[PDB]
Amino acid sequence: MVLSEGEWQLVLHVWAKVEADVAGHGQDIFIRLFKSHPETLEKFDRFKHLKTEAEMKASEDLKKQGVTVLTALGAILKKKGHHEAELKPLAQSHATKHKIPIKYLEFISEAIIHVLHSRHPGDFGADAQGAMNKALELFRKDIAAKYKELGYQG
Numbered sequence: 001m002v003l004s005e006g007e008w009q010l011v012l013h014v015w016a017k018v019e020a021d022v023a024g025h026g027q028d029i030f031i032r033l034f035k036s037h038p039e040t041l042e043k044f045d046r047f048k049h050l051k052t053e054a055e056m057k058a059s060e061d062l063k064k065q066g067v068t069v070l071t072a073l074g075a076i077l078k079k080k081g082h083h084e085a086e087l088k089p090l091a092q093s094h095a096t097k098h099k100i101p102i103k104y105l106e107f108i109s110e111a112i113i114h115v116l117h118s119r120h121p122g123d124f125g126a127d128a129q130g131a132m133n134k135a136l137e138l139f140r141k142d143i144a145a146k147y148k149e150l151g152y153q154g
């Protein structure tokens, strides 16, 4: 797939708002993911034991992880499709070390879209959401292709 420049613009416009508070958005997204799809929490040996949303909010390690994730994703989105170098180490660790199925990347995509919709309604109307969904589908398609090359296609 290929986004137009006008689609990238909508994506990078709402992303600039996210970057005003990366740690806060990171928290909201992971809590939404773990509440919505509790099976995903099992993949994290560091967080596995967290029982409630209160415990999740209070975890400093969870917050650092959310910042790690959104910083890597932001660097990919700012490439506007030219993200082959960035995807390689990402696909290799998630396929081979962490073992993260594509299905779970769809779950976190859903969480990202939920949280931008809550926090940024004015910059996240229907067209901006369509563009962000396109940018994440592109991300997933290219990651899935890399999984397949790496021997996982999970």
Ligand code: HEM
Binding pocket: 040, 041, 043, 044, 045, 046, 068, 069, 070, 072, 073, 089, 090, 093, 094, 098, 100, 104, 105, 108
């Ligand atoms: C927007 C999608 C995602 C991005 C950009 C991303 C990014 C990262 C980055 C940069 C790291 C640290 C370095 C590395 O190990 O590669 C990491 C580690 C990790 N990721 Fe992700 N990730 C994503 C989605 C997921 C999802 C959906 C899961 C599981 C349900 C997952 C599970 C893990 C695990 C288990 C680790 C190791 C954490 C630790 O150090 O204990 N990732 N991820």
